[model samples]
Target chain A: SVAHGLAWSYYIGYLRLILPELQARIRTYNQHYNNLLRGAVSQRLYILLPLDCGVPDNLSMADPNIRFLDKLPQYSNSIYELLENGQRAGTCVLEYATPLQTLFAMSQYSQAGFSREDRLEQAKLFCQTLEDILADAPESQNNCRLIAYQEPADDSSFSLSQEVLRHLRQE
Target chain B: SVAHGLAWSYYIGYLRLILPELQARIRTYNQHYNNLLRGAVSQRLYILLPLDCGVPDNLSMADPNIRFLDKLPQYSNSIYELLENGQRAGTCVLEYATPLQTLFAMSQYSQAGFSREDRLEQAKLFCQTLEDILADAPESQNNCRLIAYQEPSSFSLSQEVLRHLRQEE
Candidate 1:
């Protein structure tokens, strides 16, 4: 929980300036993610897709989305999960993904916490605790923060972004 | 330096994937920043300005670029002075910025000697040591990791995003 707390703070803080709207928007993402309804990148998929909510395309959670979570408890896990969770979190406006506005918003986090030493550690502990939780996970019993078994690159990481995936496969 | 090391590690490890070339990129930026060797940003003054390398911008012991502190044991006393001490010690690269990367590299330094609890304690100790490093810092230093001073913003902070800013902040 502490891990999630830290993760949310940093991510939200980072996004605040970039997507002031997204700053208050992740609550929607949280509900879906915490409910085991989605995973990180899911919302992005929803945005990129040309199908309806119930339709099953590549981004479906059941499409081998579970399993192999070596990358859990990671700092990005919470932020990514929040994106997934927010898809169904009530308010859904895709406007936050706008490129120019979004990049500027993300700059806020990037600008903060560089030379300072102590502030950065506070950011890190949040991640370590998240990993420990994933190690022995299953947040609300039926659900889990880990990928017990499935397909993707490896257990310690998730697949790349569309842009990254292209470059990763050398596309 | 321990504190600096831990912070660097966290920044790198967590965000490495998004910016795979972060180490090299940040180094270049920092070095250029310290050297006052920057070029114009597409003729955009608000965007970028080339440093003429003047008085304060010239060079100093506080310049973190020369520290060459890639790994931990960052620097107990003088990072800038040590960098000025020369390259016999070597050039700085990057290490602890990423947790996975840090844990993998500094298994001994970043990790614990005894139990799991000890490991967590090591982490906490690491933070404590960092606080010690900044003990003499200016009051505003606590808020360095933040863009604005954190004034307990309940104005926002939903259940989802608890409070991720620096504890010192």
Candidate 2:
């Protein structure tokens, strides 16, 4: 949960300039990631969010496009179970992925004295594993959409333009 | 120093695929930043680096292109004092800026139980401040170059192509 919270924090920080409009559209945001099993169909959305980005006041939990997940489905058959079960159960799921490491590397927390090299290695393995899983998915890729947020330039600035929102909705 | 160390760690991690070559060309790397004063020239390069990315064996400290700084200058005229003093003193300076907050937000450390909202607010202010400084610099902008590394796509993968190296060189 804290993982998603921090991800939202960094995403919000980088996109703070445009946040009001972003908040107006997207009811909630969170990070999705899995590195436990290969070809497990990991979905990178709808995991968790900061308390403030919770479902909007106007939106109902019963709405097909918005659903809150308290726990993830057990990883069996494929990680696709999370996506498939949610859809089959008639629940609308939204997921968000952030460039968290980039933000961590730049913050005051970098002085936390942790092993950056070890974390970087972990991230590399995580990305490669995800790539393998995505490569094996069936033609019905729509069942598990990967909505990637834009990476901030080296200058550490990014905008979630309307086009990016359109892509998220289409996914 | 830790700032550069972490920046290199992230950069190295993201580009670990081509690390040998990157390490071969770039003798050292670090993060550069300034948000202390407005309208002060801020150059985002060569503030510090991890211990390993230190001066290469082939390049002597005497080399004009490479020099390590122990402390930053007082903000008398412009933050550019960091750049101007280093250059006028014939010291080759390298500075780096990293998307650190992005990385931090993604790590287990994010659970440090601190106020994420507070940090986010600080970052927003920092960026706006840097924009003000950059907007005021003169034609000698060459004195301060911002080498922005590629931002990874939503999927979090990036490549430091030879062209990127050519640009870095």
Candidate 3:
């Protein structure tokens, strides 16, 4: 009984020493292979931040001509699917991704760089990349120019932005 | 013309035959019932011209409080329930309904010969009635004040009053 107790106590003491090293090693490992971690971490973070709503401390305010979607929580799933679908279809938005908003959105891409201007520029690139992704959708589907995001992006901006070009086009 | 069309083109042409002395009867009935008809007709007309929501004619202009509530639709629902529930819980709202607001609201009741100033006096009575309603609500609720509707009662005075109220007040 004494031997077992001593062994357990010693092992527990040893673990106290081992756990910190293990945690530190894991952190270092994650940092080393950050490229692999980037996609999941960045996207997850991007999908959580209140980047797309509030006072839009980082983006432009509303414009009457622009057809912005209302951010409804109920529509989050459809919105998420639409964004992924839009990416695959090759289309984008010419939204108000200001320098601050760009810096804020930087974590969405694995290959996407950091910095306010850079992030905004990448958002600028997004306006371009979405063009191709949206094009790949079935031809029978509506022409996709914009996707919806409720409450900014993470899960808030769940409203979809369909083709506003219809406003100007001849029937 | 077809035979049936020609035969009955003026169907029910003799209302005098069906309802003898109808015009005199109608006048007599109205003489007896005019007071009762007046109140009902007025109410129906008021409802048809419903007081409601709208985008202000001048995009640059709007009532401040209404604008605030419009901006926060979600919160407004909560605020309403908050006030109601608070009143029911006993800790009722304490703000006094102003005398002018009291007078203005008196128009709802006190019909016929009531003067404008008398209606305003009755409005003050209505204010007292509201206080009692809140007093009966529960303590936990935030019984709200029946705040004045900032939109003017008359359109001609609307923009002018809004400009006056919003002058750095």
Candidate 4:
């Protein structure tokens, strides 16, 4: 069953449209790698201090869009190495490393150097593009379903995990 | 489709025979309601404390069987309460809470006041019962799967969350 296509489309739309604005409204450490707070710390401490989560200390409040996974590294070892080798051992490092490792990985993938502004612009362009397609489609003209404040329910028995699992295995 | 019946049977056997013994071998607090640690704290603090997922500590020292959800409360409030009151916390409490809440809940569920000794005895009896059943089943003769040498693979993509999520939902 190719179910919930519209629902997924709505989710992607939310991520594209709503999430970007939500991120901007919330202050985050300048996710831009070149923004260079790492460079600002004393040279002696700079190399000794492992690379931090890209958000600067000054801008250390959160953006809801920013998730631990967004910042989480694929290899658990990268985080482990920092916690272990620094001899600055504690669960604090484990806690600290979670976000920092993610940030580092984010930087690695961010070879794109894509700024928030760039993403915001891309989001708008994509929304406009998707809407334009809808506008062009005669079939979609009167077929729009009103989604009035509907959100996911916790009490519902529907399981996203099982659906994905069963679907993937069957395929 | 009823898939993995043998897998499910092995799981049931583990839960029935091995798990009870495993629980007994690991010590637990005297699971009396009056001995409930939740009562040791304040009522103000009591309401603030959420119902736990119910696994015990040193389970934290790291057991493969230990799972966060096994430690996760039905309501998200338990973890949230700890975090909100505890100030900006470290992962230890998150790790710690998983087991502590579980232990608390276990004590609560143990209304029968079954002491550690009682549980241990129960575990032994259950193990003996399973062994007796196996002895009686002639079809079980000479059929063995060598799980002793085998282990789960890491490289293959699998989703415990989905399995659980759908099952739970």
Candidate 5:
């Protein structure tokens, strides 16, 4: 919830001023996303999308539209579930596909702290993230387009904007 | 500077998508104000104007424009100066500002520690900020329009923005 709160605020700050028109497009995009939402791993997906996804080359979330998309409650077997139960889960893996490390910095360095030290720490962490991503081989699979799996109850049409589909299709 | 970083991040989040057209308008507005940028205390001037100034009743900030503006550096002998010196500064005042409170909450409560206690703390503090402004009374001077002083040689304008203005113009 804090993550969503931060994500939405950043959206309003950066995107709300320049591309108010893109607001509805984002809303539409999110409605399509939530409709097909499945899996307990959904929190990271929702949090990371607008913040980390290649879509925000410049501008903006949840419903992922007018508000932060709610993180799907973690099921008992999910990593978050284990963390909730007080287990040592050092890391959980997810896809990182974008080349724009600054965008990733915003997502990874996103913090609620107001201190200069906090931001400096975030900047350093972002550098580490950038270096790690750069060190990956050029042929890494993470370079591929978004991967989608079918939801049994949902239709086959991938819930994506034409803008996104067009770009990914090109790739 | 962390505050500025947060503010810019939000700016990058919101305005990064729009045309360069709107950017000039905002600068123009700020330039007009800063031309008269007088008085020892000016930080609250830029921040609260758009939010609580009765100016931006429709188009607004507090989330980005307004709230971030509040954090502008207050000069010596201002409320911020008192806060900086570790005093129990009760009336660290500004002009009722925000659609934008959630945005403020996000920035303030952006901490990953999601506990009811943390939010409640923010709620109480925000209430204090609100009540101080509300209690300032209708006759208070802070309620007045902006005050400005002369800038010698127009050297007050930042060189970077000067270059930007030249480029944009």
Candidate 6:
């Protein structure tokens, strides 16, 4: 028998180990995905940030693609607000890292003796990297490409890039 | 502001395009993962099957790690049964494929003109592959390694294997 329930529990457990901050927010995340899956919306834009990247004071508001929401929407906020703002000037910014990235950061955090200052410095460097990447992206809907991170490598061993290539080939 | 809500929507939308059967099942899956994350269970065993693979007739029951549940538990069933049975004779079987694998299968499915027979053939092949992989796994908690698929290659470019190595390193 397919144990979908248990499998989810095990998988969610694994995710919590990697990113504990996402615990309470899972339901909201699920709703967002469910809406998209239901075809309630055509497209949505997002900016992915590392979990340690706090609200930055210097994010560019001029580029609609790079703009990020200051706070995650709550049930108090209209669902319409949640969907529309993704397309509006106030773009949704997501504090997320790939599972591998989260594990790597955990190692770094532990290696640094759990120093907050060290984590902050890394967060700043990641934000700067995001700025550079977004700067190179074309000012259009195509900029959604920035949502998925690409590791710098000659052959491009990054799994996400390879997945993108495979997706492109299918077309 | 972190738009966790919107980001989740986009991600889940992408997942649906890859595996539609998983859409309604997401909540159940989330609950399972949430339980583990909440420290309600220590460890659980699972068998990963491709979505096209239906109820298999020849699964071995001797190995505790390889046994699979015939039906996914529902709310009608006690939550304790869902958790304990996983620790008992019946093991949870997950109909899953990595995003890339699902994409590849979808292409094959379309290329075959959506032929049911071709899909079944592929499912059987996948089942055979699983059997071969499990035959060699040591019968212990370590059998959990069988849960994660390893693409066979000398210098493995498989992302999961690379992730595991990075995890091990």
lDDT of each: 0.27, 0.31, 0.25, 0.24, 0.29, 0.31
Quick one: best TM-score, which candidate?
Answer: 6
- Model 3 residue A111 lDDT? 31
Residue range with the least summed lDDT across 10 consecutive positions in model 4 chain A: A40-49
Which digits, one per residue and each the tens of the lDDT, describe model 5 over residues B1-169? 1222333333334322222233333344345433222212321221232221122332213122111222222221112211212321112223222323543444443333334454344434334433343244232223222211123433321222222223322
TM-score of chain A of each: 0.22, 0.29, 0.28, 0.23, 0.21, 0.30
Residue A121 in model 5: shift from native, Å?
Answer: 15
DockQ per candidate, 2 decimals: 0.02, 0.02, 0.00, 0.01, 0.04, 0.02
lDDT of candidate model 1 versus the reference: 0.27
Task: Point out where model 2 deviates above 4 Å.
Answer: A1-9, A13-18, A21-171, B1-20, B23-93, B96-169
Expressed as tens digits, the lDDT of each residue in B1-169 for candidate 3 is 0111111111112111222332333344335533432211110000000012121333213322221111111101101001121221111101122223222322322322335655444443443443443344332133132332324444422233233223312
Off by over 4 Å in 5: A7-52, A56-171, B1-45, B48-100, B103-120, B123-169
DockQ winner: 5
1 versus 2: better lDDT goes to = 2
lDDT of 3 by residue, A54-81 (tens): 2243222332223222221211211111
Q: By DockQ thresholds, what CAPRI class is model 5?
A: incorrect
TM value for model 2: 0.23
The candidate with the higher DockQ, 5 or 6, is 5
- Candidate 3 ranges beyond 4 A from true positions: A1-61, A64-113, A147-171, B1-169
lDDT of 5 by residue, A1-171 (tens): 123333333333432332333333334444553446332222121112322233343222211211122332211111111121233222111222222233434454333223444433443443343333323423222222233222234534433232232433344
Choose 1 or 4, whichever is better by TM-score.
Answer: 1
For residues B29-142, what per-residue lDDT tens digits would candidate 2 score against the true structure?
213343333322222232221112222332223233233433333211111222122342222234333344443332323333334454444334333433343345232132
User: Over the stretch B106-167, how does candidate 6's per-residue lDDT look in tens digits?
Assistant: 33433224355544454444445434433442332232222334324242112222233233
Q: Model 4 RMSD to the real structure?
A: 24.3
TM-score of 1: 0.21
Residue range A1-171, candidate 2, lDDT tens digits:
122223333333333223223322222221334333322222223222211122233222313323343333321111122222234222233433234344344232333343544444433433343334334423213333333332344522532222223444454
Worst 10 residues of 5 chain B by lDDT: B75-84
